[PDB]
Amino acid sequence: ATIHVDGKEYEVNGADNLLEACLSLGLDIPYFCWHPALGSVGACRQCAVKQYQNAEDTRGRLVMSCMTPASDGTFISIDDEEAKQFRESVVEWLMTNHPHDCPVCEEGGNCHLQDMTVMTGHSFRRYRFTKRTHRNQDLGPFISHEMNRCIACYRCVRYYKDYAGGTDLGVYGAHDNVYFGRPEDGTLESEFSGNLVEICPTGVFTDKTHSERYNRKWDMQFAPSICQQCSIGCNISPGERYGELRRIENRYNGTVNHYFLCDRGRFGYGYVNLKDRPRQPVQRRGDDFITLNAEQAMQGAADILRQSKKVIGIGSPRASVESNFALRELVGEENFYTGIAHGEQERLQLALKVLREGGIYTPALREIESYDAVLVLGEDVTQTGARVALAVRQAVKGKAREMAAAQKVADWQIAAILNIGQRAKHPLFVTNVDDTRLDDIAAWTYRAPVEDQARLGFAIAHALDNSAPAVDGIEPELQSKIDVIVQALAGAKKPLIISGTNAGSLEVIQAAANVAKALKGRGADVGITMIARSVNSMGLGIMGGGSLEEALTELETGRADAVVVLENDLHRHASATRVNAALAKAPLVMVVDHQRTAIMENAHLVLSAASFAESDGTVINNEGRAQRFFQVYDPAYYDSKTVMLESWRWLHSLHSTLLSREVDWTQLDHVIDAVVAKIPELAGIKDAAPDATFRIRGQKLAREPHRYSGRTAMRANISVHEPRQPQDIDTMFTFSMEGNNQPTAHRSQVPFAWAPGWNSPQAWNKFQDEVGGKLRFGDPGVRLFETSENGLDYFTSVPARFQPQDGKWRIAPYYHLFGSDELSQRAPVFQSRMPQPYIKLNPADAAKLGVNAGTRVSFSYDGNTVTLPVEIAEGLTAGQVGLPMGMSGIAPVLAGAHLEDLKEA
Amino acid sequence: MDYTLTRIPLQKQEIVTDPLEQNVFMGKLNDMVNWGRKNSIWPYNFGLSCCYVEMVTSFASPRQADLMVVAGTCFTKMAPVIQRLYDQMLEPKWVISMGACANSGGMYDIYSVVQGVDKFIPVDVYIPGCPPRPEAYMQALMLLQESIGKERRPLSWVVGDQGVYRANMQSERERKRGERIAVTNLRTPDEI
Amino acid sequence: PVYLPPRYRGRIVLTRDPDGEERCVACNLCAVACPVGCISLQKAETKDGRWYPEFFRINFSRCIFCGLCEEACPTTAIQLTPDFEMGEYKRQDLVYEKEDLLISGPGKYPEYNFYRMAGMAIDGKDKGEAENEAKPIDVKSLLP
Amino acid sequence: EPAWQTRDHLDDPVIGELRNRFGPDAFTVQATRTGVPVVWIKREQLLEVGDFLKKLPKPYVMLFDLHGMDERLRTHREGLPAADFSVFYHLISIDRNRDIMLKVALAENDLHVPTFTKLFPNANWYERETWDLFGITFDGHPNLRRIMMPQTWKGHPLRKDYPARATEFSPFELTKAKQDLEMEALTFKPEEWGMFMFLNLGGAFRIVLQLDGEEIVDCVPDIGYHHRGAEKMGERQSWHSYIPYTDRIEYLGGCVNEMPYVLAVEKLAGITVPDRVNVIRVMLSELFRINSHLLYISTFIQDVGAMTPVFFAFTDRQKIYDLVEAITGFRMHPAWFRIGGVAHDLPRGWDRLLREFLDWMPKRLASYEKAALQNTILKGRSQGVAAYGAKEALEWGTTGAGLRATGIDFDVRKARPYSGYENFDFEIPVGGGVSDCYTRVMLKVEELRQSLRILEQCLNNMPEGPFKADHPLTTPPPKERTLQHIETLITHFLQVSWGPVMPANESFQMIEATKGINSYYLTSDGSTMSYRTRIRTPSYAHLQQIPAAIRGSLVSDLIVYLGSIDFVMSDVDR
Amino acid sequence: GTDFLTEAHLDLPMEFESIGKAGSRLGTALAMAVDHEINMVSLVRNLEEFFARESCGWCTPCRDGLPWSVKILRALERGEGQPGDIETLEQLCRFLGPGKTFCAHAPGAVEPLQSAIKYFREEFEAGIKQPFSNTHLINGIQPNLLK
């Protein structure tokens, strides 16, 4: 369409809002209640402009930019007298009752209300009466809440109810005494409550974890990185101050993770600033530990490796592609073992085969929301990686969206869409062992063991296409439910099949592939996605290697006398006693890691590897795209004794000193050249971010804002003589303020969102070609996969029905969000949020055991009789006991494993 | 108190004890030498940018002055002149750094400014702040006078230790801590 | 002794309120208004209420006594005394820590307290007990 | 229409003459808030454009400024030619009492401009400074070398990709430069400098001297020894944080030095300050002008009489320093000019101090006139040598007392008034004929008298309005409303911390400084910092013309001329 | 919900269009009479109190302007009116018209303010006694008293 703003012609979209069309042109209209991902309401009246119909008009009408469609022939005006003074009156009405507590506010220089108060140009106060005050609420360990700062813009409840689907927060109040929160005091049980810090334009909902050890936004040294907590790989902006990581911000990327993070990735950054982390190369000699620098530690490690006869490199899914390849080059290629179990590696390889050889397009996180039906097989999506679950919520709301669009109403007014919808949902069929958080909006939920979920998928694939292998023994009511599922999926334009390796069985992945092939064979636009376990598990599968059990057999047999374990706990992927015995039998154990694990004891050398806040690396998504994360700070800037070098740097220098007896501190793009010249499947990772010699208009990119404070007194407590800024040869980023963070810069990766006059998280709209859409000049990361021309075959192996037995108990995975990751559970803030280690029993199983809820029972695994209190689960089945995977002492390998001796303690 | 010594910015200094804690003739003679160096001090006010009028209005051939006042900003083109004039002087020599420009970078953290005089020559006495008052300079003269009054320098180059001894004096901020913290009220800035 | 006017930019101090606590609320306005960049501090929070600076270091070898920090303080905490009798033997001991700046009384602004204007919950100051703030009317109250 | 309105000056007669001469095309008029018609010129026709300007009926006989500009990171370039670099030439026509800006466009791959020194001889040091700070080469320019940075410099400082920090101070570079300083006098090469015996005679700066016996034949002074980098830090600091850096340009001026930056920032924001702010600005500027004039007259009269030349001047400078200490913070650099006003209000004792000052100075002025008339030996000695008149002071810059000593009645306070100087009645004194070393100090004595009369008029009727404007962009806002109003706290919080967000325009403020004409030309890219700060200082043009008058003089004559010129080396190097 | 009319408008026929051109509207056509014994300051204060406490909390201008009108009218009733209240009320009622707010509660709320400001201006002018006082002194900072 063609509009005229300020007596000037512009060409904008026709079906979008006028506010987003004007913001996509770079013009400045203040707003409080409109969000690009939440639609438009009238909770404020801040976006007021003056509209004229004809080309020439005198009076016009004061309209809202977020309520006016950007149609052909509108002549609106922004900086006239009346609209500007009306917006000044609206910000005056917002400052009518606002507390005078800006310097003691967690927003401060990150506050949208300050930016829009300054932008409207209101400084003189004419209000002389009393203000409005409210009490406070305890909203858990993550969201600090205080109601005085609010302006009643209704964005929090709009996100939390319509978008996030949470059933906790809401509006309780009246004309002026309007309250936003919880009817009681308690933790917000939604997994997306951490996005309220950036959704709220005021300091009502703030980061409690950042409130403790707080610094302002301009003091934050930011970096563009990837969240390492699970496989969704949401683009994040970690920001540090005084040598510790302080705040993770949402980093905009229009392909994956546009506006919202999950709670785990938002609040699981407390492990990188732990005080028990390995910060020095520590080698134990005799019975006491000595501390070395990098040089003599590398020399000694290379001498012991030269004196050894065979080296085993045990990688990890938590490590980067560059670090795992550096290990793969340090040890021989024929002996390099992936740090996962045999069943886990089989599930990962089958998932990769489905991804890159099934011939079915795998959707990204943004385009999951555009699909017409969702079938989730055996995956706790809301608890493993919750961003796909949020996208599934949006895809469910897509039916109400399209039904509203059929009534010729606009798509940016979410109130009319939810008016027309009225609990009209796309078909969502979730299968899990127990109840999920998606059951509120699901068309159907199937509570069954993993084999029964796989058989349900096989029945769905057989009903969709007769070429699939048939499964017998289906009950007529279950057959009717299969008929309902397949007539919902056959009538869907773009069906979606979601699975994962966290189900604990190959047959669920096989059933998901069979259903996707059956949907593709009849001409549907089916997509399939698999949620992997760790952040770079799929990259480890692409690179490949032996399983952990093969390496343990090699260590126990004695064929290798030297083992190098890279960033792996080794207890989550195998049994603890066998791993401890194999590592004790090895004459040389080197552990390259950044976290104090249980294998550092009786380990001959410990290399202080760098975490994602202190290292550069490449991680591969669950979708299949390869993104890369950058360093946030130099660990040697403060406490210069520590080195904390990158894992790939450590292993490559070890390899170079093994060969030529010389230490080489190489560069990251050399390792990228190595991985694209050695592995043809990883040849595409040199397209996510460019070379380190990439300078737009001659200069680098800044980690920190232009108002970085205290540069001559930050390190003055130990030395007044200011040290040189840390020179970064690995990346295209300088560690200090003299870079470039201009929104109109030809780049794909942005450290942080800051524009002149836009100091809020709502400053990301200046970095996009259209606001709420894709990022300008492309998106970070490249796909690395193509849809295959010819798919796989139908998987004939249909599993049998799960028949319970009295002596043997089947372990059912649960995967709690705040407790199914080692890196998450090492954070001190998750301990008050994570539930206590429990076990789950059927009512019939609890009756046959004679125990009640809350009573300790003892179960024996690996010769250890460990005791846990029970919980009665209605959705669980007989013969199964439920366990939270990833716990302390409960490895995720046990998912699908058997259990014995369920006796009361 | 403890003492640091320099014996023959990259030099080495470690902590020792004075040799007078052990010849009572040498103790009186060294005290008289320190007294003579204390009450007779000739400064060399270095010509630089804009602490000149603070050393002009406070009240001079080189190589006879044992005290050098580095006042202005230390630039990349002027620093070799500072080093040459410093090596022109003869030991014993002491340095007073006037203003922030000589203590540190002094509001100029830019490419053409050397971050303090400490980068090439040692500095004995510092005066902080953009242009210091001449009374601050005169108080620094007291500070360096008492610092000179407590040293242990060799009398001759024939017999004795060939290393000058600097005194690890108590800092002025801890000595004045009681008088500075114990300030209750101040005059409001709305009057004169 | 030399007479100096009250509006003299000499030695920099922190200030206490008439209540007796430290009136600095550990924001970062003075650290970022500094053209030199010689103020460093980190916020800590009391178990009941108010913010205080965990540390507060000023590099006086770098400061030029320009006065932007006092002008930028919304609590009138950082102030410029007329004291100018400074000078240290070492550059390392020109960095004044928290104990070297916080004085035991209100300085050039005797009867100002920020926390009587702020809206947060403070020990000895409930909600609505601040200046020009009404008592918090309950949401569940019977009043229409 | 306000004075900060974004005009294009299409009604200026010079624009119509350019249209009639070179057609409607071939130049692009830019609309800016500078108050100056800015036209963009292609590279080829710059010489003929200037040559046409040289023989206008009321010609542009003075090149006020000449400097480069890195346009590679300017995002708000609307209505402007596509140029990666731009060289701006600020020209002033005294007869028209107008001024124009001539911006030659440039691409990145060819940073070559034809030289401008054949038309205006003061363009030599400006083009050398452009080749220093930027990477712009000038074709046909003699001795094109590094003037401010040392010759062993790798990059260009003012270019946008140059890091504006001090590097790691390796002592190897210091020892190497000391070794270059060791043999620069014995192994001197008279081909790099663009030059009988050669020596280096040691503000503080050195000048290379060539002598036929004792007679000076050639002299190219070496400057850049006080380069603080004011403009590059102007690209680094915010609008509010640059005020101390504006103080530290020249040390005698101070408050006069922060007047043009504050007024240009107010032009960029669009702030119209009230009457009391203008009167306070005039008062403090004339106080510091009195300080600088007293220092110059004291250092010019000391060398002959020396009976009481410093004690007679010490009381006046100390009492005005106490007055500045009462009004502002410390004495030399007030840092007291804020955006839209001043940092604080005047106390309840400034009337007594100013009245005690003003009734005690007239007999000092009579004594100064008596002392400047008593020593007739200096009057017969310094009146003969090196007296330029009416043409050398108009082509070499020379904005100070030399311009008014040559008879050219051009003062900024009367031609282009600023900060409410129209309300003060003061008669600008001018010389006659040549710019002698005695006419300059006589004009500075009469300027002291005029400044005293201005201060008397300020003390007579003082406005009782506000000391800060009511604009929302006045940084900082008033302190009491900051402490007890939420909205004022918002404005103070965002203007102090991030910086005042300012509209993307260009402004130019030109004032009469204490030793000439100072000017701040500020380009804003819409951000909270300055995209470009250009500081045109009078001492640069005053020092550039000393080879044109010591051409056949003696060394003592050169020292006398250096003493009689009011240049400051840190003001030269910014 | 409608706005006041004086005695000169009593001859108008109570229609929609007939009262429309008189700067008014018919509404529910149930008329209400105000006598000289009732001050319109208290009456319009009660009307604005009803509209402020019976509005919803959705959109900003009504939400934070009807309590402001309530407090201004309370100050005028209690004799504590200040310079900057009548113009504030008329700017409020100009900015609370149709289209500026989300619904039509606010134009009907501020229409009695329109008529009371237009006709009985002298009572609101007599309600202002004390001068403007929004800020108090700090006795360490010179105030920015503009003249």
Ligand code: SF4
């Ligand atoms: S709490 Fe925040 S997001 Fe919610 S209505 Fe208030 S200002 Fe808006």
Ligand code: SF4
């Ligand atoms: S939410 Fe914004 S406006 Fe409100 S107190 Fe915090 S910083 Fe100030």
Ligand code: SF4
């Ligand atoms: S969904 Fe996974 S990758 Fe995304 S923020 Fe959460 S833990 Fe991190």
Ligand code: SF4
């Ligand atoms: S400390 Fe201040 S007055 Fe002294 S040289 Fe530096 S800038 Fe000039």
Ligand code: SF4
């Ligand atoms: S007086 Fe100026 S330079 Fe010194 S600490 Fe304060 S803001 Fe920084």
Ligand code: SF4
């Ligand atoms: S001294 Fe003032 S400006 Fe600085 S942190 Fe404390 S309260 Fe904030």
Ligand code: SF4
């Ligand atoms: S005008 Fe209507 S929608 Fe807006 S707050 Fe008032 S009653 Fe609610």
Ligand code: FES
């Ligand atoms: S943005 Fe709130 S009314 Fe449009």
Ligand SMILES: [Ca+2]
């Ligand atoms: Ca790195």
